[PDB]
Structures are given as C-alpha cells and as structure tokens.
C-alpha cells in the first residue's frame, strides 16, 4: 500500500485529499523523517516518497491556485502531523505564496491561511532575517487588511498561546507588543 498510496498524494484531488487525512492516524505513530534521516523508516517509507512530493509541491505555487493551496495544505497537514518540525529550506519557499496570495485580494483562501498559520506558527528558527518580514506581514495583512473575521480571530489565538506559555522562549517582548498595539 507504500506504493500505491502516493499516488494520492499526487494531488488528484476529487475532493479525495480529505480520505488522504485518514493517513494522518498512521502518521502519528513515528514519522521519523524530519528528526533523523530519511533512511530511518522501515519497509514503510516506499516517508521519503510521500515528503518528496511535499517538498516538490511548492513548484507550482510559487513559480506562477485553490487546487494546489488546498493540496499544500493537506500534505503539510499530514507531514506535520506528530512531528512538530521541518526544514527550513521548504519553509523559505513557501511562506512567500502566503503573501502572493494576501496581495492577490482585490473563499478558500481563508482556511488556508489559518491551516498555514497553524502550521508555522508552532517552531521560530530564522534568524530574525526573514522573521521580521513574516510579522509585517502578519501586522500589515491578518490585523489591517484581513476582510475576514476568522482569520484574525485566528491570530489573536496565536499571539494568546504566545503570550500564554511560560517556560523556551520562542517569543520576544519587541515583536509581541507591536502585534498587542497593532490589533
């Protein structure tokens, strides 16, 4: 079923995508890809398959769009089930569709922004170069711009669960008042 599988996460989406969520149970057990190597997976990976296409499916949504953000969002989803991290290198690729598509607005769009917050929001590793960049961004569009209200409801529950925690610092006091005055 390794090989047959991947077939779906080719993005034949027919409203399938959401039977491809039923993996997600599975992927709750180890998904040992992202802490080690890929090698590490025993007669299952065949995750290598399966994180080749979701590193690779950032081609077509950066190189230009509800197809292809949809199927981002369920493989990013599912890869990122039980393990919490990932590459920067995809990251790097693929924050900048999340801008291209805030500046694209003059339905679905909105779920995928909030899967894509979830998504990001759970490890900071950039070195405060591209950081700055993504909390303008969040600033200037999710608190100014937002024409949804669910979205920003999200980013309130972001920043809440950022100020919640107390042990480590993922956060810093500069960026998480600009985001307090700001909305």
Known sequence: LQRGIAACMTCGNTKVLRAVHSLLSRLMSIFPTEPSTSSV??????????????KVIYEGLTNYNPSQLFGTLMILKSACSNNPSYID???????????????????????VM??????????????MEMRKNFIQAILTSLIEKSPDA??????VKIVEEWVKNNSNQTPTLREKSILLVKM
């Open 89 to 111: 290198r995809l990251i790097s690729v693929f924050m900048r569709s999340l801008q291209k598509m805030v500046r694209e607005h003059l339905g679905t769009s909105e779920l």
């Open 41 to 54: 997976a025993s007669k299952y990976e065949e995750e290598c398959l399966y994180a080749a296409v979701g």
């Open 114 to 127: 909030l899967s894509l917050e979830l998504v990001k929001t759970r490890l900071a590793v950039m070195s």
């Open 150 to 155: 669910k979205i920003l409801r999200a980013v």
